[PDB]
Amino acid sequence: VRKDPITKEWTLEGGALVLADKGVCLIDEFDKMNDQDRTSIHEAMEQQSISISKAGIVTTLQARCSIIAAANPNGGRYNSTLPLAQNVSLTEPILSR
Amino acid sequence: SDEINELKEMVKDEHIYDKLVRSIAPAVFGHEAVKKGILLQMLGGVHKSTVEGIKLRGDINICVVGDPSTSKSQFLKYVVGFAPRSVYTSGKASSAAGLTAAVVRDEEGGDYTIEAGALMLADNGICCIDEFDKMDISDQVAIHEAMEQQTISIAKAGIHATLNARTSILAAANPVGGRYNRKLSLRGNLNMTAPIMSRFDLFFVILDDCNEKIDTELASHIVDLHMKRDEAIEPPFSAEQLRRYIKYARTFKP
Amino acid sequence: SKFSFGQATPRTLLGIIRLSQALAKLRLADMVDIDDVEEALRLVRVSKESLYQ
Amino acid sequence: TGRGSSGVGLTAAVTTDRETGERRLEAGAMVLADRGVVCIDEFDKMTDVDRVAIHEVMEQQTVTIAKAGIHTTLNARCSVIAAANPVFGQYDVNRDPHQNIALPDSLL
Amino acid sequence: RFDLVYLVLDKVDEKNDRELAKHLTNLYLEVLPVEFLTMYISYAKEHIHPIITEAAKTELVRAYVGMRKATTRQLESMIRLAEAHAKMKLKNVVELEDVQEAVRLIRSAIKDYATQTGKSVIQRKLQEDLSREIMNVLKDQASDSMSFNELIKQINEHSQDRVESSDIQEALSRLQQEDKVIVLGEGVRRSVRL
Amino acid sequence: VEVIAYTCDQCGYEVFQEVNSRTFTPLSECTSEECSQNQTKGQLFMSTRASKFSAFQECKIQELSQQVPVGHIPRSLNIHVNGT
Amino acid sequence: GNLDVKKALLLLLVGGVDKRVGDGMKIRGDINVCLMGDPGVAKSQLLKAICKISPRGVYTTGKGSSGVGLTAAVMKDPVTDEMILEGGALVLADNGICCIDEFDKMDESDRTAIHEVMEQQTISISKAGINTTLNARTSILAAANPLYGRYNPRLSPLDNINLPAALLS
């Protein structure tokens, strides 16, 4: 929600996803900013066609977007004989989409 | 002119590989290994690549580790007045802007505007930046993205942006104790993570010694430097006639 | 580091000269002497160690 | 209802120009509280900026403000009624009975 | 980035603190110019730019070769105040004996360091024995499992030469970099295998 | 201002007027008795030293905050000064 | 009770010129006493009642004239001459009593503000408007409130005052 100029109103300005109907994002391992936005992309597939109502209007746009990603294990590819929950830092449900 | 003819004589020499490496900077003595590297960084290589897809690497990036307050600072002082429009930052300001490309807040009727930072202005420039240990962990993936392909991307609170800032980094970080271990490997004294090492070339680590002969000659080497006038050392090339020489060197495609 | 503060600065020494002539100003009988400054150190000892109870 | 925007005891200099040339210090919430009672909730679920306001109106019957205008001491006879909740569930007995909410003791 | 430091001293010092009282005993009852020295320096900074001869450099190398018995940071600045003292006391030319007061001040500069950052005496022992306490339990334990209650009750009391928690947390971040271990909270860990 | 004096530098007849409210207007130059009524009229302008000027200062009042009722906030009022 | 502390203040209500120095040796004058402790006898009206009868001694608190608006600054005014130099307390209460309370309030500006008057003669406005500096000659009477509950006397002191360098020297 980009704010208004002087005689204007609190309007709605999209970002990445509502442009990209059939495209690409990237989430590899922004470790600090992982807990910030991962609660906004795993509800783009589960609750598919997601939009929101912060401090404005309660609407819902449509976005049948596609996600690819290029994640990166902490060090080498076989950091363990132990399984994938030991290898990546992600948890199960966002991985399960 | 004769200066355009001066290149045609100077291109027909034979030892000018060794003439160049001896004529880099008077602020250091010895260590021809590090001197061979910084020359190749100063020139450019090739960047043209495969059709319809990937642009490959444009250049080579070489860092040097070593103990501080030593000959490491001299090359850094040398290049920033010698290279075309090359800039210098310390990178401690890692949270506001600069190294980390970070959008400014709304001012005078516009939010989401682009920012400065001594990274996207190394166009025909060899930016230099030191002390990798003392920053945070967030930039360490950010410049890691800035290394492989020559663009960076940002979509922070505003539309996406793709700026193609082709670059040539050059670094000088610090060891874990100031003194370099010998029996061990550099895997412990690098004080970084693993994949940015393999994303890089080799560092040509500077070693030191408390030897009773090398000190006196370096003392005599340094005292003629801060003479008011003792310009007895003869570099075979000038600052400018080396500068136009590499400007003749860049325009091929071997 | 149990109770007390200070390590005897001259900034405390010059201050004890300051309040003495102050109390010599209010009770001026032109008697700037040992007894006048004996009123002064009388106050610094009771201001200090107010925590020892 | 204890929603703690700045305005719980102040004015915030809202004048609305009062027909081109009149500026008025519009009464937020103390002209109703006078010789009456109030009640507010969720003390620990608040920011800092209300807590500095409840400091003043308890030590002193009046607020006095000069935001972009006039210093004015207007009087107020108020009496709050509080409601908060402890933090860590049922931890009151196994720890100190004090500090159990650990909001500043300026109010306690 | 600075050249030479100094610390001021303090003690009980009964002969001197009594003397310092005598200074403040005075200055209450009842050439040192205010402009003449000021115009004396502001002329004397930019008009005569003095020289340097061989008479200094011979003694100069004689100092450092015994000093080696920093590297060059100390060498660059040691001539500058040697130049300026020659520029101050004799407003013409170089001096050859201005360097004994140069080595007078910097010898007092290194008096402040007789006694981790620029030191490695604790760092020639801390990395050694911490490289020992890994290899023993990893030859006892078939797994790489090392929990937090074991490591407090293993390495805090084998030796009393190391601090309790001020340097054991930073002890493991370098082992995080040196292909040994990983962090999983204030509990269970995961170690190196073969 | 309480009195006025315009001079036209031809006749020297200083036209006087009463001072009204805070906004007023000067008059013309062909209104006098000597410098008027011909083919040449002296062009008027003002004068400082021949114009007596008074004192003026503005202040605002509030209420004692003890005789105010339990309700509304007190309000201001405008006051002026004249004389000395 | 407390005849000791009521005696410690009357000496400071007269002050006096420290020494007519003549030469450029501006010596310190006007010592400052601070208090601490948490009685229930409403410590505020103990000290501030002295201030409202002592000469030129202006009252202050934590809110309002904070350590940035303790000196003078430039602000908004009515339609008449704007950008005047509106003051706080110390540009008007020169050579008097600066009776402060609530020392844990607005300390990001206050901790600068207390040093700059304990330092002699640098009450200034180092803004983008001007770089002019005015005088500083006023005594300070402070009352710091403790941490939660009582100050534990068996515990260490300076657990509740946050300025070591302002105090012990």
The radius of gyration computed from the alpha-carbon positions of chain A, rounded to a whole number of angstroms, is 17 Å
Terminal residue distance of chain A: 28 Å
* CATH architecture verdict of chain B: 3-Layer(aba) Sandwich
The assigned structural class of chain B equals: mainly alpha
Task: Give the CA-based shape of chain B.
Answer: globular
Global geometry of chain A: elongated
| Structural domain count of chain B | 1
**Tally of extended strands of chain B?**
5
Radius of gyration of chain B: 21 Å
Binding site for ATP (chain B): 66-73
Family (chain B): Belongs to the MCM family.
Domain MCM (chain B): 16-223
Protein name (chain B): DNA replication licensing factor MCM6
Offer a quick outline of the entry.
This is part of a larger assembly, with 1 copy of chain A (97 residues), 1 copy of chain B (254 residues), 3 copies of chain C, 1 copy of chain D (108 residues) and 1 copy of chain E (194 residues). By secondary structure, chain A is an all-alpha fold.
Descriptors:
part of a larger assembly, 7 chains, D: little secondary structure, two-stranded antiparallel ribbon, 2 strands, 8% helix, E: 194 residues, mainly alpha, 9 helices, 43% helix, elongated, DNA replication licensing factor MCM7 (chain G), DNA replication licensing factor MCM3 (chain D), DNA replication licensing factor MCM4 (chain E)
Question: How is this fold's topology laid out?
Answer:
This is part of a larger assembly, with one copy of chain A (about 100 residues), one copy of chain B (about 250 residues), three copies of chain C, one copy of chain D (about 110 residues) and one copy of chain E (about 190 residues).
Chain A: H1 34-45, H2 84-87, H3 92-95
Chain C: H1 10-26, H2 34-47
Chain D: H1 51-59, E1 63-65, E2 72-74
Antiparallel strand pairs in D: 1-2
